[PDB]
Amino acid sequence: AAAQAVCLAFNENPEAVEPRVQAAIAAAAARINRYPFDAEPRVMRKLAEHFSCPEDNLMLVRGIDECFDRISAEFSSMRFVTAWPGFDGYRARIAVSGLRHFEIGLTDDLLLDPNDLAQVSRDDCVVLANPSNPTGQALSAGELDQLRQRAGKLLIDETYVDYSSFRARGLAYGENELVFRSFSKSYGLAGLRLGALFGPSELIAAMKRKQWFCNVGTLDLHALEAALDNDRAREAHIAKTLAQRRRVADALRGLGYRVASSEANFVLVENAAGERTLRFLRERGIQVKDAGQFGLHHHIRISIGREEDNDRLLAALAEYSD
């Protein structure tokens, strides 16, 4: 009996990398000396098939950072509107540019503040995560309806959509709306930092023109290609994550913790004790995320890992509730 270190802090896929995925990488390793001239159009077509949309409406990007930069470079005069508390990445990219910025606050329910949401104008480019990081909340029909009527441009970052209740709902993009999907979570390619941006064909074409030559190399391309033909493992990971999220949320509430509803692969928990909790869990080799990073101080974001990982976390916070 040896209880090793446990990391439930970066929302990573905790499963082992599928053998067919590793083998695709091992085979591409023998051709890294050559430009992937045949592999790049082949993977673009595979992406188009996977998301059932034309190749003219999607762009392969180096995560949400490239996505935000190439979009903002096309709307550099607009006011960028993001949620705060919310994902801190948009703030980081706004800090390396000269963009105007306005932020939408949250209610005590961790929902978008209607007063700030009413200040959205046709001069604004609204960038929101759905489900949100770290609240795990999903945008309501009314919120999306209001945004689509009031915003100039809208980008919905659907990084955590694979753990949501609205997976059936299509890719929503058009004249003034774009959507981003990540391959870092459910797809298990966090270490490659890849994503897909969907939007109107003219805008996508102008941003593709500004992308770097061979932006995604032969190793990442063969990796992504294999990850797209891996639905059996991906669906098993999603199913297990939804069940373990339910277990962890119910068990923590039974221990007296105040846990927020979640549509992603993590749960937001109230932490009035502050650093004392993080220090306690680090002593027991349990690594969680301080939601202070996202403006939600005295909160912790606990990721949902494998059953044995979640067992370790629940046993430690059961001990801490005494």
Added chain:
Amino acid sequence: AVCLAFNENPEAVEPRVQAAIAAAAARINRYPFDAEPRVMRKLAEHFSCPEDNLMLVRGIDECFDRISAEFSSMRFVTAWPGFDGYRARIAVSGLRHFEIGLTDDLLLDPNDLAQVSRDDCVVLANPSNPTGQALSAGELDQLRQRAGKLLIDETYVDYSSFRARGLAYGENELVFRSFSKSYGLAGLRLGALFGPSELIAAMKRKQWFCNVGTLDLHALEAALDNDRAREAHIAKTLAQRRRVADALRGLGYRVASSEANFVLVENAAGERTLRFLRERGIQVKDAGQFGLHHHIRISIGREEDNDRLLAALAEYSDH
């Protein structure tokens, strides 16, 4: 097909580089939080400089963009004929641009070089693509005193005669090295930028999070501890370049001197030559892409690749 058109390293990928990739493949589900700083230190060791003076980039495109974003008021000065990538990046940024032409000897035009001022950011490839020419002591001397900023793109330095010289960077000078040629990582499109510590730090901030993934990082790391293979490829390329240049001149072709892994050849026949080579399964680059129309840039490949090129152009030397 014999591909002699993209200046790629034709050798087989070393087993230790393939094994490092296979091992990283089992951890692609996790962010490379320990691997990124470790590889940065490995690069610092390899190029024998502080980590504060180097930046890992997604090739010459990232390099040009992040430098130009810091000097957006300056007039950018590039060679033409010369590498066409700088033109493309200037197009997407809307920067002021002046071009230095070439003499009949394919050297920088002294008249244009005399127009260089302290308001200019000069970006030149040494050795040059596709001429294969190297900057003279006098040219570099003149650039170092006239130019406001200077970026030397040393992508083809491994095949040159000035490898001993090393890295030249300072207050107003930066140097770029590619891992696409000699190092054999063309499909990963990685490079290193060297410059003054203050400017490097201002450009690092603007880099994307996890810009270079766990697979590319572990490949690059293994590729840096592989000098035996890299030196054998350099030696073979210099010998085969001498073979190909001498043989083609003996067949009557006009071949330019080269310090790179290719040779520039006169092609008055135009497309007829490219079509002839393609029907014999051989791909070469039309130097029209770089402003040198009715010229071809032939890459130096493996002995068997060159055997086929020389046999086809020996046959063409008759027709």
